[PDB]
Amino acid sequence: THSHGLFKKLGIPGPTPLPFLGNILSYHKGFCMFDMECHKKYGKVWGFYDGQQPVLAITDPDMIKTVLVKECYSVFTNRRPFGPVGFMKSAISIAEDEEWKRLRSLLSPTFTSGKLKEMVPIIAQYGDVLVRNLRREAETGKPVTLKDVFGAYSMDVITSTSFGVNIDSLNNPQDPFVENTKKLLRFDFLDPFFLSITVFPFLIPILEVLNICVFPREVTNFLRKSVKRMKESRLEDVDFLQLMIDSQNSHKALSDLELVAQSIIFIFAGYETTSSVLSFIMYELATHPDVQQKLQEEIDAVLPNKAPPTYDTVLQMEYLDMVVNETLRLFPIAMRLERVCKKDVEINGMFIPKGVVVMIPSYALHRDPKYWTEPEKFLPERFSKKNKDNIDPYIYTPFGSGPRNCIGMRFALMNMKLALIRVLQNFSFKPCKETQIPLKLSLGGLLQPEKPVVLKVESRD
Amino acid sequence: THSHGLFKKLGIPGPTPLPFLGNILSYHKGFCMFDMECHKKYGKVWGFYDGQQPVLAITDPDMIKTVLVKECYSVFTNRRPFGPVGFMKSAISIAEDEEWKRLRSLLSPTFTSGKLKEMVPIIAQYGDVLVRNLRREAETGKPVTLKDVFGAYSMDVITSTSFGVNIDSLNNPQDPFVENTKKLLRFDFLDPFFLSITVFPFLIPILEVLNICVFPREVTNFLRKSVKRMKESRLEDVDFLQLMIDSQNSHKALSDLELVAQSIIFIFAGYETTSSVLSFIMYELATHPDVQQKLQEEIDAVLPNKAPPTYDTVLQMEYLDMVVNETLRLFPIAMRLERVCKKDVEINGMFIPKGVVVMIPSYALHRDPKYWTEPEKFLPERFSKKNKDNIDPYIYTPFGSGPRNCIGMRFALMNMKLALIRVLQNFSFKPCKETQIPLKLSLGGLLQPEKPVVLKVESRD
Amino acid sequence: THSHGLFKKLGIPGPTPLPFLGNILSYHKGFCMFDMECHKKYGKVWGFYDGQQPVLAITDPDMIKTVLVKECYSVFTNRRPFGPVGFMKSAISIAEDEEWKRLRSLLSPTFTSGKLKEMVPIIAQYGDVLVRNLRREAETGKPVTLKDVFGAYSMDVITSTSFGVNIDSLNNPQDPFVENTKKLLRFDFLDPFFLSITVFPFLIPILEVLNICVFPREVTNFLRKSVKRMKESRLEDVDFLQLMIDSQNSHKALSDLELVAQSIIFIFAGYETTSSVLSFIMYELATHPDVQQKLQEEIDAVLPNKAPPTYDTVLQMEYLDMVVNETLRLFPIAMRLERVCKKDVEINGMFIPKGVVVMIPSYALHRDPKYWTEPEKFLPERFSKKNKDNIDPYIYTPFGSGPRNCIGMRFALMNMKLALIRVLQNFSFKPCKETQIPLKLSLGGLLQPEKPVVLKVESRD
Amino acid sequence: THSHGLFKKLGIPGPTPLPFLGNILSYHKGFCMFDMECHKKYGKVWGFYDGQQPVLAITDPDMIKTVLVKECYSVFTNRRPFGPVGFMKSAISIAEDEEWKRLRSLLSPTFTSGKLKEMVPIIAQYGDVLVRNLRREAETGKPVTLKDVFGAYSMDVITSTSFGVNIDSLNNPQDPFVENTKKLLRFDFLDPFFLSITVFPFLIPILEVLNICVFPREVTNFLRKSVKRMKESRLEDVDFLQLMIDSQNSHKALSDLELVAQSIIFIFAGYETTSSVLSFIMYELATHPDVQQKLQEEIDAVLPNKAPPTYDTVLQMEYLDMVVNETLRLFPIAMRLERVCKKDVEINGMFIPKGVVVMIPSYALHRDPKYWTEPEKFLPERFSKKNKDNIDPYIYTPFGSGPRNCIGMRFALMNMKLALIRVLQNFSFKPCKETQIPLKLSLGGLLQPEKPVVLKVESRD
Ligand code: HEM
Ligand code: HEM
Ligand code: HEM
């Protein structure tokens, strides 16, 4: 099969591809293990095939800068398609070129510090809810599963910061607004379906004309009307929906379908991510009680008498920022960043022909011995205000970099910190016998634990 | 396009087909209206195209007999495929030829009168549940939606008669066993997806190798393990599951996957059907209060003092059998029966080449003036023990006929009658202003009401 | 189906589309008849659907100018895809965007007046061959079929002006170089296959990965090696091949596969076109003997004593230019021009959303009563140096207009005129009884005669 | 992927399959080498996957008998599909079940000894033509390529024994009837296209509805009308066409399209096969001059004075029968026989589930040391009337066995022997320096030589 000669011709190393399958059989241990092995075997750049799709992996920090910043608009502007999307075509994370650029413009003022400081009282109320829910699991000394308790917390923060709907998801697990939203899970890009998509990407057109979508047709049909109800109950009679409604009052405003799609993508974006990361952080705190104590002391110092957190007092807390960042290092939940090269180019001395997918293997670089000492260890001091200067922003990329980076970065860090502050103000977290130490990562296509994290939760009362 | 000449060549009338689409655009008013129009325009036989699939419609009672009985095993043994089925390939209603014949054998003793008489105490307990639920909607004079109250009743009867699980679905609408099972709805064979299947049936192979199934992969993955739990909690420590478990203790026994598929098909089969028919019957009773009174008097006569119904006392009630049958006449929820002609044949003097789909248009014949006087009226006397002899069993076919007829006929009639007896022992049913008189049928691909049936429910107390 | 609402929403008239088929059933009489009917029914602009592909037809000369010239590079740069192309992707007529722009640059100097004046002695020798072949059919008074005699002439001119190979195709109809090249016929975009492509354009990806090509794999595999033989017999030891070989000695030179593709596209481009047009011209001359006499007199005046034609004496002949142009008016063999709108735009006051195919219906405009008197008549005087000023270059477009017009315009007119001069110097052409007067055009997807043109050929000796 | 567990579950050995590809990458050396390796590694039975299609290979002579004879009608009646066939669906070699059984009936009397004895004078005349053509290549001592000279001979015999058309193909290589027929070449079931068919057999439906056929649409459209011309020039005013025309004067007669398809399949069947085998025989004779001398002496003894061969004198020649048979042993051009198991069965003690493809690896068994001494050597004595009794007819299967064996066996052997007799009566055949000794077989999907056979041909004058 062809085009399997491309990397050989350019003199670029990589595992030899099978006809039709390319290298996918080498995903049997997951993107992370494949990426490290490749980084190790082949060095600073390499190439492989997702079916017939050539993928060029790069690790030089200069050349990563060019791809994510300098030549973003001109050359490296879109991600690769992945499956049938339906109307979700209009979602900023999926849209391309000038539609993207216009969307990214219309939504930027929504993620500003000013709007985010306005949303904090809402995210705070549900840290309280979280606490009372944790307390009920802690007065009845039963091991807690974090994904479920943080899931319900994440869910809570979303439903409020995007539509004003206010639910106790953990206690109302069967509210229609909680039921649909809980189906918006991260895509397993190595499950039968998406593997098939990589071998038969000519099948994508087929599904499209059949209205078959990787965003389940019914979750989308539920919110599309849920939004047009809210839209016309507020109109006329502080959340993301309002901020978008206010905006459609670049250019060309925001279409009504265009608004529904962004609403959906934020839910999708903020739900399993926030839930997952918080779990990873509580695992590390529970297996490193010194770090947990140190941070608890920091929180009490800024917030004595279990004082509530604020926007300014959150940004005050340096050790908490160190804990969060180091966790995202060990578990960057995206694992890779990816851009489609839209033209023949040469950058930092290397020819890149049109159509290749440039890939940055985040997981692998966050654990590269050549930039991190004992990269497997949990050492928050790597981010102390002393050492935070020796860290290359193109090697540590948990939100990506450049114009197409994670637009929800600020919000996500602030959301996760408000949960951590409130939770640690009230509770300590200890390993159980049934806790999996050391945590093994899932050999699938998601960064998540093989086994869900379970811990003992104790009242500081 | 070809083969669009087939009917023209055989001298068979029918609407002229468009290339690729055949006649599907003539489904814009539904199978029922198309069938009547065709019966009227073209007479006793006609032909049309579901894409490229030729479909030969027949209405002579002799020739229907040949197709459903005399030449079933030899010629007319399977239905037509309809979409990707996954493992549900093994479900009796879908299986073909000797696999079907063997399955139909292994499950026949499960639907016998003897087993059915044993299941009646279980179906009865949930008529009681139904009552208390109706009473709560009747002491608070709010119009009741029948599909929801009978749905929860149907659901209840199924969960018990197939797995022993005992739930108040109406009050536990969010039990995991109620949540999955409520997704097993009747297929809308004119929704975008299935229309596309008829135009692109070459797409079926494509979806199959992609594990894409019209039976949602997650409902099936939930019950497959739900069964292997029950299976191994009873083994070792009266429902359909047991009767199948006892059977795998023709020939070749029942595979473990083969058992899970039948379990699923019965749920699918008994849930929206029972729920739908009961609604149609209560609509007719409410718009014909004489008939409702007459039947109430019959029930009190057999069952004085609201005596509970039994298997024998149900079969006693002739006017109730007349009401149920007449309703199935006006609304035969399958609408058509269909067999694939597997060979060149000639029956009753007409050549039928291999591959055609012989179709019997049940809806249309149940309302044919040539066999029924005032076919639009609700006249239960057409089935009185006096006139029940002048009714051609190949014209009145609400469960089909012959070896491949509805294996659940007995159970379904008995289930629906036990619900009707208990409900009418306690309540009368009257039209609301918001009730749709006269009921309009859905122009889709299901026999169901355009608008859901709503009635006033009053206590005979 | 969707997107069938687009034109309705924009307030644009057009025939109402069927689901999936759009308007293709309205091609049952050909693009030409559909275009006129539409122009007539709907006016100055209209819209229709090639399946799901929206096609916007326009006839205002200002707005045509914008599309073909002013906004060519920025907005209207590519044609629409049509089927699986294989490596022919690299052919200038098919390539897109900057690949096109670079190719069109590398081949422009090949079609200059200077190169074309150099090629004339070669094209002339085969007008002689043509004559002797015609004379053999004229001394034996048998009606001649023009496509066959002009086909062999066209073939001859190509094989020489592109590779130096010198064959009498008419007398060597079974030379391997004549056999393959004669398979490069114009695509019937309404034959079963291409119709299917319009209804299932999602099938194009499928064929591509199967190396299935609308350019037969074996004709292309024959010339690809035929070229690499010639290439390496001239290297080292006046045709298009040389001019390209000299060029690969914008930028990025011409790839070796890139050269083979252009070679092929010129053959394809020059063979049935030149052959077809010459036939149309000889039909009109034979049914308008005054015009034929007048031109014969002109040729004798410039070229007395049957003097051979030259580059300068060809451009001298004004009545011949009038005859050729008027014929291309009545039969513009492309029928339409087409550009893909690559962005949301507004031109001359009309919104055009991304993805639509702007179409200019050349055939229909060449016969529009609003710009031509008696448009069905053959009146060469419409192009006399007197009236040639009142003709809008955006209404008379037989080679298209703007940067993406027919790069072979000069060559094609010069090739056809040299054939006409030599042929008329020696012969007159008269209708037979078996000649089809009036010529009916083919209801297919090609501009060609229903029945092939047959004429009586007489020696001016 | 699934169903890749089937052979593992049944305890059947075989090479471990890759997802989607099964074992096709093990065809990189051809069916023959794979089959031997497997026979060697795994023994008497084994299993592998052509994509997802399970293929069960068997070598026990009893169990082969069951599959090809005893359970042919009931269980093992069809071959496997292979690609899109169009109307060629009706060709006996491709048709299935009762259509096959009826076709095989209607054509059996055409291949009888009596008809075959009637066709011999026609096949003889073209042995003469063959000779004069060979003599022209032998008086001009140039090495002859056998495929071309025997191709033209084969072609000649076909065109006459199927339609009465009489051509010297070698000297008329560009007659329209010779041009089309020469495109009917053996399918390379490992060329890109057919490999793709095995990985994407769900693509077969797609091509079918696109009228795309592995029998080129134009060769079939040429003969379909070529036949309806001959058909209606003989009607009314000794070949296969006549014998079929006489037959349509089981049951249901032969359709007109059904007749055209058989005509085509015989051409396809008799052209490259006869041409190929004759080449293999002349290679062995030329590298074993003793055998060549011995046979020449036999021919002179039966046919002194270069007497012409007859039907009876051909069957007389035992050493010639030995030479032909031994060659078919070393090169059985089908390589394998194959039947689709249409039901769950057990034969000779082994469970075979429905859908598997039972395969008999002819090539491998013809060279199995366990039944043949020095199986690589060319020893015609293995078939002497002495040893011809120790040869298992289910191990030596160059025409298959049972009801679905090669219907053209008699004709093919007789055709090849008449060519050999005439050729050897007049010429001896010697190796050239450019002859490939030892002949290497093609690693493709055809049994043919890597390099075409070239020999020195000398006049016995
Ligand atoms: C711990 C939480 C999160 C992490 C680790 C994370 C990580 C990422 C990464 C790596 C990217 C790709 C950046 C690139 O390509 O350079 C991304 C993109 C994106 N993120 Fe997040 N993200 C998080 C939370 C969120 C949240 C809460 C939102 C809610 C609005 C969000 C919205 C988006 C969007 C819309 C994009 C695509 C932006 C574009 O293409 O212009 N993310 N995220
Ligand atoms: C009011 C209720 C029902 C109606 C009107 C109904 C109607 C029908 C009809 C018309 C058929 C096709 C018969 C034919 O092709 O001749 C059928 C088949 C079938 N029914 Fe029902 N049905 C009902 C309830 C049920 C229930 C409760 C079950 C539960 C077991 C069931 C199981 C089946 C099965 C398995 C088949 C396919 C049988 C075969 O192919 O052998 N049905 N039904
Ligand atoms: C009577 C003869 C011919 C006629 C009427 C004709 C007509 C046309 C037309 C209408 C176009 C499209 C122009 C547009 O889109 O604006 C075209 C394009 C083209 N023609 Fe011709 N043509 C003729 C002969 C030839 C010949 C002999 C060649 C040989 C080189 C040729 C090469 C091309 C090419 C390469 C294109 C595509 C150019 C591009 O996309 O940049 N044509 N022709």
Ligand code: HEM
């Ligand atoms: C040296 C020449 C030939 C060889 C080695 C050969 C070999 C074979 C083989 C192995 C089969 C499959 C048998 C089986 O599945 O058991 C076959 C089938 C067949 N052969 Fe030949 N063959 C030859 C020549 C011919 C010729 C000249 C014809 C002309 C009529 C022909 C017509 C057929 C047909 C129609 C079938 C399929 C029969 C059926 O499925 O009923 N073959 N051949």
